[PDB]
Every structure is written in structure tokens, then in C-alpha cells.
């Protein structure tokens, strides 16, 4: 997450921090972002789980904010189901079908209970996306620069603009490694962008003046690199898939 603000207690309450467990009593390691799309379901990126696709390796945190008091009873979740898209594949640079679903529960078996700091995010209407050039917002704990190694301590959000496939599929962009199950987004000034460690996190667009999960941070050459937008899994083309694994 390069070049944004730090979020607060009612900014991006659907954001989910996905951590990988370490052996022993070592604290866990931050692995990916994610979005609460149902009280029991978080959507993220498959490429985040392909090395260790067993649910036992992860723990999910919700309600993150500098003004929110951590309560492990309501904000920490075990993963009782880990579903990766069955046709997830890795290409030269791009991921295909880069989407995953995590079914979550607290230590007492409950789902996420809504609050000032925890809300679900709406899925888009089928095959419906905001127009290109819309302002979408991105969020994460990822690097604040391509060159930076340090990860930030607290949640950042920024604003990018949707980029058309025609513009994105130009050779000096990404050429044929973009398909229509992806969504490109960038800063027209190329100063703000998502980065390493934002993977699986939300791309939030308005659709009918409703905040909507239009994308899942998936990939990109560099971070905030001129002529090179962030590529997102286009959620509107996966709705059947999502609602087939839930309901």
C-alpha cells in the first residue's frame, strides 16, 4: 500500500488480516489481506494459500484500528473451511482464478458480529462493474514502497482509478497477460498503488452508490510503477463460484 492515509475505526470494517501460524509459541506471521463478505465468510486470494492450503495454518483478525480495543473473543477467528478455486494456476507473472474463501469462527464457535469496527461488504451484481475511471479504494498492511522492505505497523487505505482492459492490454502495459476475469486499477499520476503484502485485500468500488467488493488484490509488475497498474481478481465474474460454496 504505497502513498495513502492510515485508516480508523469505521474505515474498511470489512478488512481481514490473515496470519500464518508459526510452530511453538512463536507469534504468527502476517500473510495476506481479505474481506468479510458474510459474517462467516472472508474472501481473499488463492495465491496466498497455495504453499500451505490446510486451514489449520491460519488465523484471521477483524476490527483493526488504532482506536479499537483488541478483544480475542470477538476479533480472532479460526478457519474452519479453506476453499481455493479449483482452477487456480500460476502464469509467468499473472495468477489465474486467484480467489479463495475462508469460513471463520471464534473460539466459542460464533461468526463475526457486526459493530463499529466490523461490517460485511456487499458483492457486486452479476457481471456488473463500476465504469472505468471510477474511484476505488484499496487497503492494507503491505509495503509503502516497492523498494521498502519494512512493512507498516497500521492499516493504510488509498484511492486508485479503474483502468479499461483495452488500455491495460496494450503491449507497454501487460499485453495478453490480462483477461476479462481481471480488473486493472492505477493512479493516473502513478504515485499510489497496492504492493507486496496487500494480496487478497479489497478493491472497493461504488456500484449504484453502494460500496462493493469489485476486486481482490492479485498482482502487478512493481508497485506504483508508471504504465503498470495493479491487477485484481474481478469478483463480478466469480459470483456463481462464490455462492456455490456458500448457502
Amino acid at each position, epitope marked *: 500500500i504505497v502513498g495513502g492515509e492510515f485508516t480508523e475505526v469505521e474505515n474498511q470494517p470489512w478488512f481481514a488480516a490473515i496470519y500464518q501460524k508459526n510452530k511453538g509459541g512463536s507469534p504468527p506471521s502476517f500473510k495476506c489481506g481479505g474481506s468479510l463478505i458474510s459474517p462467516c465468510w472472508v474472501a481473499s486470494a488463492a495465491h496466498c494459500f497455495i504453499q500451505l492450503p490446510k486451514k489449520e495454518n491460519y488465523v484471521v483478525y477483524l476490527g483493526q484500528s488504532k482506536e479499537s*480495543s483488541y478483544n480475542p473473543g470477538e476479533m480472532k477467528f479460526e478457519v474452519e473451511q479453506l476453499i481455493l478455486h479449483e482452477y487456480y494456476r500460476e502464469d509467468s507473472l499473472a495468477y489465474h482464478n486467484d480467489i479463495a474463501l475462508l469460513k471463520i469462527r471464534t473460539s466459542t464457535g460464533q461468526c463475526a458480529q457486526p459493530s463499529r469496527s466490523i461490517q460485511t461488504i456487499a458483492l457486486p451484481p452479476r457481471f456488473t462493474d463500476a465504469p472505468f475511471g471510477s474511484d476505488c479504494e484499496i487497503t492494507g498492511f503491505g509495503k509503502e514502497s516497492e523498494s521498502d522492505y519494512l512493512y507498516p505497523k497500521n*492499516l493504510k487505505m488509498s484511492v486508485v482509478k479503474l483502468v479499461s482492459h483495452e488500455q491495460c492490454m496494450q503491449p507497454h502495459y501487460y499485453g495478453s497477460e490480462i483477461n476479462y476475469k481481471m480488473l486493472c486499477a492505477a493512479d493516473p499520476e502513478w504515485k499510489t498503488d497496492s504492493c507486496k503484502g496487500d494480496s487478497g485485500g479489497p478493491l472497493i468500488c461504488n456500484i449504484e452508490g453502494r460500496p462493493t467488493l469489485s476486486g481482490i488484490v492479485s498482482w502487478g509488475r512493481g508497485c506504483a510503477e508508471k504504465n503498470k497498474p495493479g491487477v485484481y481478481t474481478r469478483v463480478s465474474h466469480f459470483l456463481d463460484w462464490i455462492q456455490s460454496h456458500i448457502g
Partner: nanobody
Amino acid sequence: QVQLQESGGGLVQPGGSLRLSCAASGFTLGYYAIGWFRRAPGKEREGVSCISSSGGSTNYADSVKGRFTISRDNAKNTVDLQMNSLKPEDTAIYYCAAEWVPPGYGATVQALCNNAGYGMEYWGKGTQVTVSS
């Protein structure tokens, strides 16, 4: 092979003092926020007092304010609970619990303490504190 272990339980005269200690083995307790929780006969588990991993933040139940004092030694891998001016009402099983607080939250350990300890990762077997004539 991760273990939390309480010690210090016993039988003390009302108004007397008693110190509990929680020691860890198999891991570094210093990364973890620690809570002391107690279950009295008949009532449900309640947060007595809590402390953050660096020690900067503490929380106390209203019942024990000014009487109980939590502290820790991250060099020695321990957390202590000093209990002064003990009252019969304090008679209970005292448990030590440890939870890693992720980054991105408030500095407070208030919510960690007021919620009966649900979700705390690690728990000791508990030790007995009895206050009686």
C-alpha cells in the same frame, strides 16, 4: 511443549497479602499480553487484572483497584500478581492466560480483561487462593 504455570496459591487471613506468579516454558512470554482470571465458587470466570507485552498498559477489575498489582519480567519470562488487603470475596481459582495482540489495535488491554477471557490462546492449570478466618 508450550506451558504456562501458576504458583503462589494458598490460605491467607483476611486483610493479608499474597503474591502469584505465572511462568512460561517452551516460548517467550514477553511477546504476549497476560491476563489473570479467576473462577469463584458458583460465579463465572472474570478478568482480575491484565498487562500488555511490554508492560506499558494495565487493566484492573473495579473489585481489586488499589489492592492488586500486576507486573512482569520479560527477562525472567514471568508475570506477577501482588494481592494486598485480601477479602473473602477474592477466594477463587486464579488462572494465568496469554494472548498475542496483533498490530493495528489500540494500546489498551481493557477489552482483553473485561470479557471473561474467551479466545485467550494459552492457559495455565490454575492455582487456589483462599481467604478465610
